[PDB]
Amino acid sequence: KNELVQKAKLAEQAERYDDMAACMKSVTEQGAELSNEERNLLSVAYKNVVGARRSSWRVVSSIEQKTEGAEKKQQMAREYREKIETELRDICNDVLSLLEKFLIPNASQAESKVFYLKMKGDYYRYLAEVAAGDDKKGIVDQSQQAYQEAFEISKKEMQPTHPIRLGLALNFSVFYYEILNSPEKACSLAKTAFDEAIAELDTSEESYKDSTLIMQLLRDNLTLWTS
């Protein structure tokens, strides 16, 4: 039943996000529109699951450039960087599948759709990062596709304060920069969303801190790319 959820909530509490995500990967596989609670749990789980590997790959990758003494460790560094890359892709695709298969086509709430699509973008963007060879150009535009579809839905049936829309914005704003390498497009979008989210200064309904927490990231991103 929701025995898995319970396992997940424990796996979350246990920081055993690997299990957690598998639990929710199954809840998804159950073929139901996960409750915003469940939703959040699935994300939380996979957030750390993909996050673990990104932050792994990231350090290895940078150490790939900073090889022990000479460039002889390159072989090992790479070999292992690839060992991570393998895993990361599995997790990404796994998430991506869930999105293609269950999440996106099940999500009834417009807000939810944005979220999953953002995941799509997010997780596709996680591929681009690793996507050396000739794959990127396509995969980056496959991430873009996903982010844009999300943006379309966000700027439609989502108020400018909505943390998901802002969550999308930031996630998509970082995409244009880090991935597409087009600050011009990146900075604007970020501004746009944040700039648009400012007018709503809630003189008495808002999204409290969650929404504001993003603005700070947004502007803190904006100011980084500013330089």
Binding site: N40, S43, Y46, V50, G51, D122, G167, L170, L213, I214
Partner: peptide
């Protein structure tokens, strides 16, 4: 989570 559930 704010950014944790949004993955930022």
């Amino acid at each position: 989570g704010x950014l944790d559930x949004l993955d930022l």
